[PDB]
């Protein structure tokens, strides 16, 4: 769903303070997210 044209890559997530960032490796994609 998130990455359909990525196949079998890797997923890493980092959060600081009150902000969430998602990074995907293989396609080099970054997405900004925040719930709090
Ligand atoms: Zn990807």
Swiss-Prot record:
Protein name: Translation initiation factor 2 subunit beta
Subunit structure: Heterotrimer composed of an alpha, a beta and a gamma chain.
Range of the intact protein held here: 108 to 143 of 143
Domain of life: Archaea
Described function: eIF-2 functions in the early steps of protein synthesis by forming a ternary complex with GTP and initiator tRNA.
Species this protein is from: Methanocaldococcus jannaschii (strain ATCC 43067 / DSM 2661 / JAL-1 / JCM 10045 / NBRC 100440) (Methanococcus jannaschii)
Sequence similarity: Belongs to the eIF-2-beta/eIF-5 family.
